[PDB]
C-alpha cells in the first residue's frame, strides 16, 4: 500500500488539501493497519485465554 | 518475460511443504509486491488512456493468478485444520490446474490479439 500511494503521491502536485483518492488510500491503509493491530491484540490475549 | 517469470515464481510455492506456513505466506506476498512494482513501472510508457489495452489485460491476469495462488494457500491452511480429507488433494490439483489455465489464457490471448 505504501508503494502504491508513493507512486501516485510522487506523480501529482503539492496541494495542501486532501483529495478523494488520498482519502481512499488512507482508508485502505487504515484497514490493513487495523488488521495488523487486531493480529497484535489476538497475539496478546492468546496466552491468557485462547477463547477470546 | 518478467511478469510470466513472476507467475512461475508464485507457482513454485505449491511444491513447498504445507507445514512451513511463513515460507509460503512470505513467498506469495513478496511475489504480489513484485507484480505491483512491475505493473506500475510498466504503465509509464503509454499515455493516460482510460480504456484497457492488450498490455493492461496481461499484467492484470498475472496479478489475478498470483492473488489466486496466495488465496488458495490460505484456504489450504484453513482446511488442514478444519477437515483434512478435502485439503490433501487440493494442492496436487492446483499443481496441474494453475499452469494449464495460464497456458490456455496465453494461447487464447495471443491468438485473439494477433488476429486483430
Ligand atoms: C497520507 N497517509 C497517512 O497519513 C497514513 N500513513 C501513510 C504512510 C505510512 C508509512 C509510509 C508511507 C505512508 C499512508 C499510506 C497510504 Cl497506502 C495512503 C495514505 C497515507
Ligand atoms: C498499481 N498496479 C498493481 O498494483 C498490480 N495490479 C493492477 C490491477 C490488478 C487487477 C485489476 C486491475 C488493475 C495494475 C494494472 C496496470 Cl495495467 C498497471 C498498474 C497496476
Amino acid at each position: 500500500m505504501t508503494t502504491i500511494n508513493t507512486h501516485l503521491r510522487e506523480t501529482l502536485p503539492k496541494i495542501p488539501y486532501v483529495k478523494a483518492i488520498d482519502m481512499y488510500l488512507m482508508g485502505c491503509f487504515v484497514f490493513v493497519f487495523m488488521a495488523l493491530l487486531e493480529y497484535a491484540l489476538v497475539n496478546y490475549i492468546f496466552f491468557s485465554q485462547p477463547a477470546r | 518475460i518478467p511478469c510470466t517469470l513472476i507467475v512461475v515464481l508464485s507457482w513454485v510455492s505449491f511444491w513447498i511443504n504445507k507445514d512451513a506456513v511463513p515460507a509460503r505466506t512470505s513467498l506469495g506476498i513478496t511475489t504480489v509486491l513484485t507484480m505491483t512494482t512491475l505493473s506500475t513501472i510498466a504503465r509509464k510508457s503509454l499515455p493516460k488512456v482510460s480504456y484497457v489495452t492488450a498490455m493492461d489485460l496481461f499484467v492484470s491476469v498475472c496479478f489475478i493468478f498470483v492473488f489466486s495462488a496466495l488465496v488458495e494457500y490460505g484456504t489450504l491452511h484453513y482446511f488442514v485444520s478444519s477437515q483434512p480429507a478435502r485439503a490433501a488433494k487440493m494442492d496436487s490439483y492446483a499443481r496441474i490446474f494453475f499452469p494449464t489455465a495460464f497456458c490456455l489464457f496465453n494461447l487464447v490471448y495471443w491468438v485473439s490479439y494477433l488476429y486483430l
Side-chain angles (χ1 to χ4, degrees), chain A residues 1-6 9 21-22 24-30 32:
Chain A
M1 286 301 305
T2 290
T3 103
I4 288 194
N5 171 74
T6 299
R9 270 218 84 84
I21 198 148
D22 281 3
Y24 205 72
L25 290 179
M26 287 188 294
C28 278
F29 188 84
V30 160
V32 300

Side-chain angles (χ1 to χ4, degrees), chain B residues 70-103:
Chain B
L70 193 54
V71 163
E72 179 269 339
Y73 171 64
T75 307
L76 174 54
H77 179 91
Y78 171 80
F79 264 73
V80 299
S81 66
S82 180
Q83 44 99 17
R86 196 85 167 179
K89 62 183 180 295
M90 68 157 306
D91 195 332
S92 85
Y93 281 167
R95 285 183 191 177
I96 197 97
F97 283 167
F98 270 68
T100 58
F102 190 70
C103 278

Side-chain angles (χ1 to χ4, degrees), chain A residues 3-4 7 11, chain B residues 33 36 40 44:
Chain A
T3 103
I4 288 194
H7 281 309
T11 42
Chain B
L33 270 161
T36 66
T40 324
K44 294 166 181 124

Side-chain angles (χ1 to χ4, degrees), chain B residues 3-4 6-11 14 28 31-32 35 57-73 94 96-106:
Chain B
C3 292
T4 312
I6 291 306
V7 170
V8 180
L9 172 85
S10 67
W11 284 351
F14 303 132
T31 305
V32 163
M35 191 50 58
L57 169 65
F58 194 87
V59 189
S60 301
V61 169
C62 293
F63 190 88
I64 291 304
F65 263 78
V66 183
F67 191 63
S68 164
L70 193 54
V71 163
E72 179 269 339
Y73 171 64
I96 197 97
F97 283 167
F98 270 68
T100 58
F102 190 70
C103 278
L104 173 137
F105 159 74
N106 267 321

